[PDB]
């Protein structure tokens, strides 16, 4: 009877504790991420914390290139993170082969979301303790942000944030939009949009960053790529000459 | 505590233990003693056969796997039949397909992997038997110790079963001596009988109670029982 | 082929089936009964491939008897013939089809009327006053088309058969070794042991 | 050899003024041997009629299949199936056996109970639908039937006239075919009534 | 069909005629037999249009998934996926395929995969019904490390002869240049190459 | 690996209850209100778009889904379950009907298929029931307009009007007072907007409300011309603008 | 059968004859060889009638489901890929030969698919037994940048070439116009150049001409 | 409530998987093993406790090779380790068969990773009871990795696991700071022998046997090989000296 | 593994009882009452609609009476969804019988099959049983009018009159009190409505809370007819029997 808390069946309150505990695992990495939409680009920023000195910093990342156009940032443990990334890459390649065109960011999100919904209904499958943020510049929809959780839920965003201090970053962004009145960063270049993202990340968290404290991904028409420590440094220097 | 983590082999105890495997390991300790030792020219097995009544027979402890390989068991007899039969198939396959005698070291790896599969999946149970494997291949004489945990180890000599610590200490003491007993099987066997008797208590090794096997340079794995072991008691 | 004849008269169905069993150059038996009783008021005759013939007849007998026990009732002849057609129709598109033709003669105790069904290995079923499988039909259909009447008695029917059998013994190529005649009516199934000179 | 010429037989359907007619011969033979002169090839489920030429065994089977399907259709839909719908059911049922087809030549006839519109349709053995506004032929004497129909026919014939026309097409077509004939039945279908008639024809 | 791939100083160039036939009828006179399976790995197709299309489509899918997981695939790796598909299904395929790719370290590479499913890495390769007629010509006119211009000319001459003698070849001559500079498509018309 | 949960996760309790289904029903109760109203010439289904972050674009999500050109659905409960139920429902309308008869299934039958899918999740091994209740409205030539409710148990019933979710009790009582067998579609739509207003806390406009109808055929939404018998879908989702216009005559 | 495809400045148009045959007999004098895969993706089919129909409905059905799932307009390439992979899976046993055209978010498209699974792309295409008669017209009058009206005339003329010179073709001309910004327009029987002349006599028989043996009413009501 | 640690794929209220954490206990209880990434390859070393004089010296080899360019060493349940290497070998064979090229170390890592992660997804299986250090040389240099029972893995400059993991990590960090320019394969071998000797103090009760293998572009031609004979004894002497 | 969450729906109690079956029956007992009364010239089915409203569309509703054949129908008590699963297989079974024998399926044969299906979920599969009880009303030429009943256990029996669902005890007593072997359909129709009326947990017994059906051999024909009364037809009969 007290097992409605070990597998995905309903509790008397109509709740699914395993799903809730999965959400809890998403913060395990203690890292925040956020995405914003440019005029015709999409940017995702994520904190990067490599404590051990024995690690090769270049092999640590929670950002993934799922396809030429889709990028994915993951909030949660790396093994579940990688399981999700491999699956999405597979789904992306197959879709292209079967339907003749590149899988849209929102479609991949729905597909991964549906997959998660299943781990929510079938007992032998556990949910993945991760939140996935997919981004791209869709050929039909333009800049896109779609995020999925361990509950099989997903929606499109003007911008979004995920992690332990999600609320701080969200309200910060909310405010900026309540002000600008537009649902995107009216900036032509992605560098300036990356700068906007890091700027507000600093403001909301009340913290300064070095080139090794962040991870950046950018999605433009027909290409998603990540920035290098140096690309970032150049971005950080720029925000420094404004404050 | 333990009672909550020993219901199957797919559960770790809070300290990283696998009790079902451990309980299996116990079956071996409750089994009759058997010794294994080797020189550079021969490998020998000596086993104490246990009987039920004085009206029953003494259950065999040694099994031949191929002309150059064989083993002695301690624990669940059925599991030994399953494992030795699998060792026979592997020896057979090596010959038929590659015209190659299966190396003792390989037999050990194969055994380890087979045992392992029954300690990580639901529904299966670990094997409840220990095995001492002797053989003579392209690298000489060999002795392996097989535990149901999947751990297989090459040694100069060893012993498993009840009161086995006796023979083991003795072999660990005689080491520099028996390992040099080359070209003289009778001497190596006597060292084996002396090792085993170090684990006696209940009685003394008789003719229909002692079991010995040997393999080596020009000696196909052969078992000795009854009258055949008389000249050693 | 073997001779398989059936004729439905006023209150009964009469089946006649050749007694020869020839294999290549030799007639092995001359008293073979090419029939199986499916139930007390339903008789089936058969002809075709060496092994399929009996395997099929017996397989059906087993099923009808099973139905009888389970339901403690006897299926109508119409129902039995439908079950038989279904089985053959499945067969025709299976890996190795049953190469068997059959005549089903039964007495429907509920309607109180005799019935005759002709069914080939393809699952072709038709109900008729008289039927035949194989080459016999080439001589007997026009014969009966001439000498047949609906209200005939069982005795008249047997004479109608004697007429058919004689024509067959006169014109057919093979020596079928005569026939075995059986009658199905309100009282069940019986064999006319005296036709070798009736 | 040719499964479609083992048993023989023909079917034909025609549209008239607020009516439809479908007819068939009664022969069932085996090559040259005529076996039964009572083998009707027309069936009906509710107010929808289906004629089937070809291999007798498949003719019987498809009938039993469509009865089975139309019965459940009525149970679940709570209304009898219509001609247009049935045509699709027939088409998909046949194509389901695309590579091991039933050797038949189905023909559907009927009046849509809601629109009152007359309907007829033909199919090849794997389901291709031919929906004609005038007539549909099928069977071993289909060539003769095409000749008779393309000539005799004219639009909006009254039920009494359509009967004459569809009967003359059938009768004369069957008489030029060794595998068709041996009797015939004609159906005259109107919204309110359906008349069945057995024609008198040569018996050779 | 007349197809070929030639390595030269700056990379590699693929060439092909544009004829597809069903008997003596030209089902398509402007066919594009030069197919892309990756940014700088292309192939020349010959044999069954249906078979080579289906194989290329699958190789492209495999390389896309490969890239998602382990970065850029080598030309060798692409030639291996083709080969695996062609060998394993040799009883149901009629695909003579040439694989050509440009790599920064290896420069240009050419792998020919004939009917049986074997693979052959060469300086250049010719294939298709039209290839038989230019074995001598190509053997006598090929040189290693030619320049882009010399290579385009070699291919233009070779294929015009193949088109000249083979009824299954013809239409326009298509080329694809693969170098560190990128991907360049070339097309030549009858009026130009016929009189070479 | 291999699902070893081949046994039922929903069983009978001594009292005769099927807990998992009751609990599923409970989850439905907690969901955002949704309702359906059948008129003489149409049906209307609506719900509130409870945006879960002002940064989220509520248009990217639809609680009201088209199943066939003459059938729509809305729900209350677990949105992710509903989403997959929509995909299955659209597919089954095809695999079990259009591919057989070459025409879309009548409302009651599709509802029947959906309902079956839910019943199976109540007895099959290794699964939990779906945490949603559906409201399906549609039209078909021989049955006209209809409205159905499908619960986690797999049970379904026909309605003149009704509501499920959060404030269903209040909403139902309100619908009983305003409904009559003479309502025109516009009337039903008006009544729907009124009923929903009580259940909405904050903003109430065409951007926080989602409403669709099953009414006349929309040849203008077909995408092509030329086939007389093809007249267009009866299903139509109202636009934000279309909603605000009606809110002014509220 | 004669089916064709022709691209024009702002779209694509396809046409087909309406004859169906079984050997030398016309099975259907007016069947429709133009199938709708989606509102703006149409397909002209040749070869084995039932095969073109079945494969056309199957992919059409999947396109609809895909469209609903992705909330996007179907693309011609998707139909092309789903069809070819299906046809290839069947090693040509499904006798379908098709010309698939349409307009979608990426523009206007013209393709052809053969029973074995190969596809082709072009500005003008023809398939079927009338393939050559049609293509000769196309090769004779096609030019780059045609107007919707010019394209329809060219396509329609090509179909006629088959109707008149190919015994496997005849009757009417069906057309479908797919223009980049509008609804697709299907023109069933756009041309009817083979109306049968008035018969010489009426063969209406005098009632009673047919000899009847027996009669009866049939029960339809349950 | 409680009991969130009796079944594998179960999440505790704080989002943990206790069965995995318990697996780690079996790993920490194991022999110490390490990996050092030099400037053109990687060096592997492990502690082999001598339970008794009866174990034939140099005979129970722990380090395992995958394909011809990859080395693997692990601590914890040895049988679980072999099981994982068997999967790696199949994994590497499947990759080569299709892509021709021997498997790149990074790709190999994720292959082991997904597999180990898979064993934390169901209650019908048990997580791996080993942490594995592996790597080799490929098209783009040398790579060193360590994989945990959770399925987690990252690239390392130096890595250690087992009983004396702390001593080792301390020592490895020292090397890193005193060699920003890089360490050579020859040096990594000696330093490895030392780190093992030092880390042996957390088990100074039983006597041990050292084992080292290496994969270096300049020393082994990119192929994985065991350090035997003189180069080995030489490393032992270098350690035995600095241990005093 | 999974064994931990297995309810074991198919086991005996120490008293030799089948738990789930018992509990399912316990569920049925709270379901709307359904009554079946068999007369000499016909059969009657009447059920009480559980849970109703002003808004419930009754003309399109059916939650207790289902047509299985042209000669067979059933009344349901329990989970409607579970019943539909069984109902549909019963419909297929009847058509299979017809297709095979070219004769309508004998009523008992249909009932036995459906009962066998229920029985199965009782002996194997680890799945819960169907929470349903059926009253079968049918006619065939071998036994004429028949009335059967099947419950979750898979057992079935024949009756002259019977009820399933709630207040069956009270209802059975009332039936066993006024039933007479020589009843006429109309007599049965009245006895049925009176019983429901006295067992109803509701205020009054109105038409909107009932489903009615009869299987009579309309003399002016010779064939049997099934009639599932419509809302008005029930409203009429209700006023006549004197319940207005």
Tokens for B191, please give them. Answer: 């060292």
Which of E57, E68, E69 faces A97 most closely, judged by CB atoms?
E57
Domain at I238, CATH number: 3.60.20.10
For residue D88, the distance in angstroms to the closest alpha carbon of chain F comes to 5
Crossing angle (nearest 10°) for helices B185-196 and B164-178: 150
Cα torsion C144, C148, C154, C158: sign = negative
In chain D, the domains with their CATH numbers are: 1-204 (3.60.20.10)
Concatenated DSSP letters of chain F: ------SBS--B-TTS-BHHHHHHHHHHHHSPPEEEEEETTEEEEEEE---S-TTB-GGG--SSEEEETTEEEEEEE-HHHHHHHHHHHHHHHIIIIIHHHSSPPPHHHHHHHHHHHHHHTTTSBTB---SEEEEEEEEETTTEEEEEEE-TTS-EEEBSEEEESTTHHHHHHHHHHH--TT--HHHHHHHHHHHHHHH--S--STTTEEEEEE-S--GGGSSEE--TT----SEEEPPHHHHHHHHTT-
Segments in chain A forming alpha helices (H): 17-25, 78-99, 105-121, 166-180, 190-205, 229-240
Which of F66, F87, F99 faces G61 most closely, judged by CB atoms?
F99
Which of E69, E74, E84 faces H101 most closely, judged by CB atoms?
E74
Domain at G13, CATH number: 3.60.20.10
F225/G176 touch (CB, cutoff 8 Å), yes or no: no
Domain total in chain I: 1
CA atoms of A120 and A132, how far apart (whole Å)? 16
Closest to E70 in 3D by CA, of H155, H95, H38:
H95
F96 CB-contact burial (10 Å; exposed 0-12 / middle 13-18 / buried 19+): middle
Q: Which residue of G has its CA nearest to D135?
A: G28
Closest to D166 in 3D by CA, of D152, D176, D183:
D152
The three-state secondary structure class of G66 is: helix
CA atoms of A5 and I47, how far apart (whole Å)? 41
Which of C124, C128, C137 faces D56 most closely, judged by CB atoms?
C124
CA distances to G17, G161, H26 from G164, rounded to whole Å, are 10, 6, 86
CA atoms of A68 and A88, how far apart (whole Å)? 13
In contact, B33 and B196? CB cutoff 8 Å: yes
Question: Going by C-beta distance under 8 Å and a sequence separation of 6 or more, which residues neighbour residue C145?
Answer: none
Cα torsion G32, G34, G36, G40: sign = negative
Ranges assigned E (strand) in C30-124: 35-39, 42-48, 100-108, 113-119
Which residues on neighbouring strands pair with residue E108, listed in sequence order?
E102
CA atoms of E131 and E117, how far apart (whole Å)? 18
Q: For residues D184, D190, D195 and D201, what is the CA-based torsion angle, rounded to 10 degrees?
A: -20
Domain total in chain G: 1
CA angle (D197, D201, D203) in 5-degree steps? 130
I57/F162 touch (CB, cutoff 8 Å), yes or no: no
Walk across the sheet containing I210-216 and list its strands: I161-164, I34-38, I42-48, I210-216, I225-228
Q: How many CB atoms lie within 10 A of CB G150?
A: 17
Q: What is the DSSP letter of H66?
A: E
For residue E108, the distance in angstroms to the closest alpha carbon of chain G comes to 29
CA atoms of F247 and A22, how far apart (whole Å)? 42
The three-state secondary structure class of B228 is: helix
Q: How many CB atoms lie within 10 A of CB F187?
A: 19
Q: Is D64 on the interface with I (CB under 8 A)?
A: yes
D202 CB-contact burial (10 Å; exposed 0-12 / middle 13-18 / buried 19+): exposed
How many CB pairs below 8 A link D and G? 93
CA atoms of C6 and C21, how far apart (whole Å)? 20
CA atoms of D103 and D59, how far apart (whole Å)? 8
CA atoms of G90 and G166, how far apart (whole Å)? 29
Segments in G90-174 forming alpha helices (H): 131-141, 148-165
CA atoms of C44 and C35, how far apart (whole Å)? 6
CA atoms of A115 and A128, how far apart (whole Å)? 10
Phi, psi of H8 (to 5 degrees): -55, -75
CA atoms of F92 and F105, how far apart (whole Å)? 10
In contact, A80 and H118? CB cutoff 8 Å: no
CA atoms of A211 and A194, how far apart (whole Å)? 13
Domain at B200, CATH number: 3.60.20.10
D79/F142 touch (CB, cutoff 8 Å), yes or no: yes
In contact, I61 and I53? CB cutoff 8 Å: no
The CATH code of domain H1-244 reads 3.60.20.10
Question: Going by C-beta distance under 8 Å and a sequence separation of 6 or more, which residues neighbour residue C109?
Answer: C41, C74, C186
CA atoms of I58 and I115, how far apart (whole Å)? 30
Structural element, H or E, at residue I68: none
Q: How many CB atoms lie within 10 A of CB D40?
A: 17
In contact, A168 and A130? CB cutoff 8 Å: no
I4/A123 touch (CB, cutoff 8 Å), yes or no: no
**Residue in the block written with tokens 């699956």:** A87
The three-state secondary structure class of B171 is: helix
Indicate the pairing of strand G184-191 with strand F224-225.
Answer: parallel
Closest to D169 in 3D by CA, of D148, D185, D151:
D148
A90/E65 touch (CB, cutoff 8 Å), yes or no: yes
D72/I98 touch (CB, cutoff 8 Å), yes or no: no
CA distances to E31, E127, F227 from F68, rounded to whole Å, are 41, 52, 19
**Residue in the block written with tokens 């510049």:** A137
Active site residue E94: no
In chain A, the domains with their CATH numbers are: 1-243 (3.60.20.10)
CA angle (F155, F158, F162) in 5-degree steps? 100
For residue I28, the distance in angstroms to the closest alpha carbon of chain F comes to 8
In contact, D117 and D111? CB cutoff 8 Å: yes
As assigned by CATH, the class of the C1-198 domain is: alpha beta
In contact, B108 and B146? CB cutoff 8 Å: yes
Question: Going by C-beta distance under 8 Å and a sequence separation of 6 or more, which residues neighbour residue B154?
Answer: B104, B105, B108, B142, B143, B144, B145, H55, H56, H59, H60
CA atoms of A126 and C115, how far apart (whole Å)? 66
Q: How many CB atoms lie within 10 A of CB B40?
A: 14
Closest to I139 in 3D by CA, of I104, I165, I115:
I104
Closest to G170 in 3D by CA, of G195, G189, G154, G194:
G194
Structural element, H or E, at residue G109: strand G107-113
Q: Is G173 on the interface with A (CB under 8 A)?
A: no
Which residues on neighbouring strands pair with residue H43, listed in sequence order?
H36, H214
Concatenated DSSP letters of B22-79: HHHHHHHHTSPPEEEEE-SSEEEEEEE--BSSSSSPBPP-EEEEETTEEEEEEE-HHH
Concatenated DSSP letters of chain D: --GGGSS--EEEEEEETTEEEEEEE--EEETTEEEES----EEEETTEEEEEEE-HHHHHHHHHHHHHHHHHHHHHHSSPPPHHHHHHHHHHHHHTTTTS---EEEEEEEE-TTT--EEEEEE-TT--EE--SSEEEEETTHHHHHHHHHHH--SS--HHHHHHHHHHHHHHHHTT-TTS-S-EEEEEEESS-EEEEEEP----
Q: Exactly one of E1, E52, E75, E179 is catalytic; which is it?
A: E1
Crossing angle (nearest 10°) for helices D56-77 and C77-92: 110
In chain E, the domains with their CATH numbers are: 1-196 (3.60.20.10)
Tokens for H226, please give them. Answer: 């065991």
Which residues on neighbouring strands pair with residue B58, listed in sequence order?
B51
CA atoms of E161 and E155, how far apart (whole Å)? 10
- Reading phi first (left if > 0) and then psi (alpha if -120 to 50, else beta), residue D53 is in beta
In contact, I207 and I61? CB cutoff 8 Å: no
Q: What is the DSSP letter of C76?
A: -
Tokens for D28, please give them. Answer: 């069932």
The three-state secondary structure class of H65 is: strand
Q: What is the DSSP letter of H203?
A: G
Domain total in chain B: 1
CA distances to A43, A51, A201, D27, H135 from A213, rounded to whole Å, are 16, 11, 12, 91, 27
In contact, E57 and E49? CB cutoff 8 Å: no
How many CB pairs below 8 A link H and I? 7
Report D:165-204 residues touching I (Cβ under 8 A): none
For residue I130, the distance in angstroms to the closest alpha carbon of chain F comes to 9
Question: Going by C-beta distance under 8 Å and a sequence separation of 6 or more, which residues neighbour residue A96?
Answer: A67, A102, A103, E61, E64
Structure determination technique employed: X-ray
CA atoms of E156 and G187, how far apart (whole Å)? 47
CA atoms of B110 and H86, how far apart (whole Å)? 11
As assigned by CATH, the class of the F1-250 domain is: alpha beta
Closest to F183 in 3D by CA, of F84, F15, F42:
F42
The range of the structural domain enclosing residue I160 comes to 1-244
């Amino acid at each position: 009877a007290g097992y409605d808390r070990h597998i995905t069946i309903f509790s008397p309150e109509g709740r699914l504790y395993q799903v809730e505990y999965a959400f809890k695992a998403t913060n395990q990495t203690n890292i925040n991420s956020l995405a914003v939409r440019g005029k015709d680009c999409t940017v995702v920023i994520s904190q990067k914390k490599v404590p051990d000195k024995l690690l090769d910093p270049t092999t640590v990342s929670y950002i993934f290139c799922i396809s030429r156009t889709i990028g994915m940032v993951v909030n949660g443990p790396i093994p579940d993170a990688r399981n999700a990334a491999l699956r999405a890459k597979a789904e992306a390649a197959e879709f292209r082969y079967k339907y003749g065109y590149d899988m849209p960011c929102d479609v991949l999100a729905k597909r991964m979301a549906n997959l998660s919904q299943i781990y929510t209904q079938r007992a032998y499958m556990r949910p993945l303790g991760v939140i996935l943020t997919f981004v791209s510049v869709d050929e039909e929809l333009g800049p896109s942000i779609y995020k999925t959780d361990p509950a099989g839920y997903y929606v499109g965003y003007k911008a979004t944030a995920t992690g332990p201090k999600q609320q701080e970053i969200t309200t910060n962004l909310e405010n900026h939009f309540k002000k600008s009145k537009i649902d995107h960063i009216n900036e032509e270049s992605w560098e300036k949009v990356v700068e906007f993202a890091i700027t507000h990340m600093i403001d909301a968290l009340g913290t300064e960053f070095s080139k090794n404290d962040l991870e950046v991904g950018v999605a433009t028409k027909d290409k998603f790529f990540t920035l290098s420590a140096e690309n970032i440094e150049e971005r950080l220097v720029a925000i420094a000459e404004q404050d | 505590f333990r009672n909550n983590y020993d219901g199957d082999t797919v559960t770790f105890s809070p300290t990283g233990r696998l009790f079902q495997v451990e309980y299996a390991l116990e079956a071996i300790k409750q089994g009759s003693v058997t010794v294994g030792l080797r020189s550079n020219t021969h490998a020998v097995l000596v086993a104490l056969k246990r009987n039920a009544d004085e009206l029953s027979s003494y259950q065999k402890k040694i099994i031949k796997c191929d002309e150059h390989m064989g083993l002695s068991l301690a624990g669940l007899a059925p599991d030994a039949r399953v494992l030795s039969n699998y060792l026979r198939q592997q020896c057979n396959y090596s010959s038929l397909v590659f015209n190659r005698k299966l190396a003792v070291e390989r037999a050990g790896h194969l055994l380890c992997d087979k045992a392992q599969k029954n300690t990580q999946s639901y529904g299966g149970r670990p094997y409840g038997v220990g095995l001492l494997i002797i053989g003579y291949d392209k690298s000489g004489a060999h002795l392996l110790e097989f535990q149901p945990s999947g751990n297989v180890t090459e040694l100069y000599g060893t012993a498993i079963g009840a009161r086995s610590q006796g023979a083991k200490t003795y072999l660990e003491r005689t080491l520099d001596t028996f390992i040099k007993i080359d070209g003289n099987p009778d001497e190596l066997i006597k060292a084996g009988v002396e090792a085993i008797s170090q684990s006696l208590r209940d009685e003394s090794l008789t003719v229909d109670n002692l079991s010995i096997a040997i393999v080596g340079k020009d000696t196909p794995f052969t078992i000795y029982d009854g009258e055949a072991v008389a000249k050693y008691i | 082929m073997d001779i398989i004849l059936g004729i439905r008269v006023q209150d009964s169905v009469i089946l006649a089936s050749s007694k020869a069993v020839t294999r290549g150059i030799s007639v092995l038996k001359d008293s073979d009964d090419k029939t199986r009783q499916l139930s007390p008021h339903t008789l089936m005759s058969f002809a075709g491939e060496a092994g399929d013939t009996v395997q099929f007849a017996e397989y059906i007998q087993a099923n009808i008897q099973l139905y009888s026990i389970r339901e403690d009732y006897e299926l109508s002849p119409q129902a039995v013939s439908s079950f038989v057609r279904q089985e053959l129709a499945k067969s025709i598109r299976s890996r190795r089809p049953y190469q068997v033709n059959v005549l089903i003669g039964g007495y429907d105790k509920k309607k109180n009327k005799p019935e005759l069904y002709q069914i080939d290995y393809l699952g072709t079923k038709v109900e008729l006053p008289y039927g035949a499988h194989g080459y016999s039909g080439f001589y007997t259909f026009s014969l009966l088309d001439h000498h047949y009447r609906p209200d005939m008695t069982t005795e008249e029917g047997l004479d109608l058969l004697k007429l058919c059998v004689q024509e067959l013994e006169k014109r057919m190529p093979m020596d079928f070794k005569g026939v075995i005649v059986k009658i199905v009516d309100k009282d069940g199934i019986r064999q006319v042991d005296d036709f070798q000179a009736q | 050899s040719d499964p479609s010429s083992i048993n023989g037989g023909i079917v034909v359907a025609m549209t008239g003024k607020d009516c439809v007619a479908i007819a068939c011969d009664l022969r069932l033979g085996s090559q040259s041997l005529g076996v039964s002169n009572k083998f009707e090839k027309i069936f009906h489920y509710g107010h929808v009629f289906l004629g089937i030429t070809g291999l007798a065994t498949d003719v019987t089977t498809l009938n039993e299949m469509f009865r089975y399907k139309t019965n459940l259709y009525k149970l679940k839909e709570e209304r009898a199936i219509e001609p247009e719908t049935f045509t699709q059911l027939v088409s998909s049922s046949l194509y389901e056996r695309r590579f091991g087809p039933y050797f038949v030549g189905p023909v559907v006839a009927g009046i849509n109970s809601k629109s009152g519109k007359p309907f007829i349709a033909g199919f090849d053995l794997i389901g291709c639908i031919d929906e004609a506004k005038d007539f549909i032929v099928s069977g071993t004497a289909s060539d003769q039937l095409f000749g008779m129909c393309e000539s005799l026919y004219e639009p909006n014939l009254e039920p009494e006239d359509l009967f004459e026309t569809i009967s003359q097409a059938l009768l004369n077509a069957a008489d030029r075919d060794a595998l068709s004939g041996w009797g015939a039945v004609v159906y005259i279908i109107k919204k309110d009534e359906v008349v069945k008639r057995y024609l008198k024809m040569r018996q050779d | 069909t007349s197809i070929m791939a030639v390595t030269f100083k700056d990379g590699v160039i693929l060439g092909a005629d544009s004829r597809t036939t069903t008997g003596a009828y030209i089902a398509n006179r402007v066919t594009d037999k030069l197919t892309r399976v990756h940014d700088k790995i292309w192939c020349c197709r010959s044999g069954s249009a249906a078979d080579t299309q289906a194989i290329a489509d699958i190789v492209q899918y495999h390389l896309e998934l490969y890239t998602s997981q382990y970065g850029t695939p080598s030309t060798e790796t692409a030639a291996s996926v083709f080969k695996e598909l062609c060998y394993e299904n040799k009883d149901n395929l009629t695909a003579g395929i040439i694989v050509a790719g440009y790599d920064d370290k290896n420069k240009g590479e050419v792998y020919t995969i004939p009917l049986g499913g074997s693979v052959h890495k060469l300086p250049y390769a010719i294939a298709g019904s039209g290839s038989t007629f230019i074995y001598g010509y190509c053997d006598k006119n090929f040189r290693e490390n030619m320049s882009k211009e010399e290579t385009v000319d070699f291919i233009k001459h070779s294929l015009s002869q193949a088109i000249k003698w083979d009824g299954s070849s013809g239409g326009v001559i298509r080329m694809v240049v693969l170098t560190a500079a990128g991907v360049e498509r070339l097309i030549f018309y009858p009026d130009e190459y016929e009189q070479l | 690996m291999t699902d070893r949960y081949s046994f039922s996760l929903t069983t009978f309790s001594p009292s005769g209850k099927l807990g998992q289904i009751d609990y599923a029903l409970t989850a439905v109760k907690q969901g955002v209100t949704s309702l359906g109203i059948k008129a003489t010439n149409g049906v209307v289904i609506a719900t509130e778009k409870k945006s879960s972050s002002p940064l989220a674009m509520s248009e990217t999500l639809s609680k009201v889904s088209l199943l066939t050109p003459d059938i729509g659905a809305v729900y209350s409960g677990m949105g992710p379950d509903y989403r997959v139920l929509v995909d299955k429902s659209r597919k089954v309308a095809h695999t079990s009907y259009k591919r057989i008869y070459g025409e879309y299934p009548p409302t009651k039958l599709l509802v029947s298929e959906v309902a079956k899918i839910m019943q199976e999740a109540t007895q099959s091994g290794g699964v939990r029931p779906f945490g949603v209740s559906l409201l399906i409205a549609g039209h078909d030539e021989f049955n006209g307009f209809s409205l159905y409710q499908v619960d986690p148990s797999g049970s379904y019933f026909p309605w003149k009007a009704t509501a499920i979710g959060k404030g269903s009790v209040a909403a139902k009582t309100f619908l009983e007072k305003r409904w009559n067998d003479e309502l025109e579609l516009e009337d039903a739509i008006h009544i729907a907007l009124l009923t929903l207003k009580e259940s909405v806390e904050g903003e109430f406009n065409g951007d926080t409300i989602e409403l669709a109808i099953i009414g006349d055929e929309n040849p203008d939404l077909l995408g092509y011309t030329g086939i007389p018998t093809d007249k267009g879908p009866r299903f139509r989702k109202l636009t934000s603008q279309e909603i605000n216009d009606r809110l002014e005559a509220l | 059968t004669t089916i064709v495809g022709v691209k024009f400045n702002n779209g694509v148009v396809i046409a087909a004859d309406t004859r169906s045959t079984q050997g030398p007999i016309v099975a259907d004098k007016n069947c429709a060889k133009l199938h709708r895969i989606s509102p703006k993706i149409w397909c002209a089919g040749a070869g084995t009638a039932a095969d073109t129909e079945a494969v056309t409905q199957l992919i059409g059905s999947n396109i609809e489901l895909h469209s609903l799932y992705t909330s996007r307009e179907p693309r011609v390439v998707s139909a092309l890929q789903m069809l070819k992979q299906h046809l290839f899976k069947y090693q040509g046993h499904i006798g379908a030969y098709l010309i698939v055209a349409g307009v979608d978010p990426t523009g206007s498209h013209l393709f052809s698919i053969h029973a074995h699974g190969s596809t082709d792309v072009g500005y003008y295409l023809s398939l079927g037994s009338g393939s050559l008669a049609a293509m000769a017209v196309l090769e004779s009058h096609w030019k780059q940048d045609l107007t919707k009206e010019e394209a329809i005339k060219l396509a329609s003329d090509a179909i006629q070439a088959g109707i008149w010179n190919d015994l496997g073709s005849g009757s009417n001309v069906d057309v479908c116009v797919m223009e980049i910004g509008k609804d697709a327009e299907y023109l069933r029987n756009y041309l009817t150049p083979n109306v049968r002349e008035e018969k010489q006599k009426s063969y209406k028989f005098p009632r009673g001409t047919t000899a009847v043996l027996k009669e009866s009413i049939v029960n339809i009501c349950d | 409530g409680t009991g969130y640690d009796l079944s594998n794929s179960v999440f505790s209220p704080d989002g943990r998987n206790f069965q995995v954490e318990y697996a780690v206990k079996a790993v920490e209880n194991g022999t110490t093993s390490i990996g050092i990434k030099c400037n053109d390859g990687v060096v592997f070393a492990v502690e082999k406790l001598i339970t008794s004089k009866l174990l034939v010296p140099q005979k129970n080899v722990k380090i395992q090779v995958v394909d011809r360019h990859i080395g693997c060493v692990y601590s914890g349940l040895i049988p679980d380790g072999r099981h994982l290497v068997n999967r790696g070998r199949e994994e590497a064979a499947s990759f080569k068969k299709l892509y021709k090229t021997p498997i790149p170390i990074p790709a190999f890592a994720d292959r082991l990773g997904q597999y180990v992660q898979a064993h934390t997804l169901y209650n019908s299986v048990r997580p791996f009871g080993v942490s594995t250090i592996f790597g080799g040389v490929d098209k783009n240099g040398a790579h060193l990795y360590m994989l945990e029972p959770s399925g987690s893995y990252w690239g390392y400059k130096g890595a250690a696991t087992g009983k004396g993991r702390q001593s080792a990590k301390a020592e490895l960090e020292k090397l890193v700071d005193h060699h920003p320019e890089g360490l050579s394969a020859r040096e990594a071998v000696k330093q490895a022998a030392k780190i093992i000797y030092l880390a042996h103090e957390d088990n100074k009760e039983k006597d041990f046997e050292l084992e080292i293998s290496w994969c270096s572009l300049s020393e082994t031609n990119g192929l994985h090989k065991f350090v035997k004979g003189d180069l080995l004894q030489e490393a032992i002497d270098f350690a035995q000296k600095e241990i005093n | 593994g999974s064994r931990r969450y297995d309810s074991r729906t198919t086991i005996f109690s120490p008293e030799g009882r089948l738990y789930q079956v018992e509990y399912a029956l316990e569920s049925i007992s709270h379901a709307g009452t359904a009554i079946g009364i068999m007369a000499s010239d016909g059969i009657v089915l009447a059920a009480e609609r559980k849970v109703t409203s002003t808004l419930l569309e009754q003309d399109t509703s059916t939650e207790k009476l289902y047509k299985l054949n042209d000669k067979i129908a059933v009344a349901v008590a329990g989970l409607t969804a579970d019943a539909e699963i069984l109902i549909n297989t019963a419909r297929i079974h009847a058509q299979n019988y017809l297709k095979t024998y070219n004769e309508d399926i004998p009523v008992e044969i249909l009932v036995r099959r459906l009962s066998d299906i229920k029985q199965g979920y009782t002996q194997h599969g680890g799945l819960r049983p169907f929470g349903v009880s059926f009253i079968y009303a049918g006619y065939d030429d071998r036994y004429g009018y028949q009335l059967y009943t099947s419950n979750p256990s898979g057992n079935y029996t024949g009756w002259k009159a019977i009820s399933v669902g709630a207040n069956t005890s009270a209802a059975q007593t009332l039936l066993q009190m006024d039933y007479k072997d020589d009843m006429k359909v109309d007599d049965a129709i009245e006895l049925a409505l009176k019983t429901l009326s006295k067992t109803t947990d509701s205020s009054a017994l109105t038409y909107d809370r009932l489903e009615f059906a009869t299987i009579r051999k309309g003399a002016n024909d010779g064939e049997v007819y099934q009639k599932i009364f419509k809302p008005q037809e029930i409203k009429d009969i209700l006023v006549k029997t004197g319940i207005t």
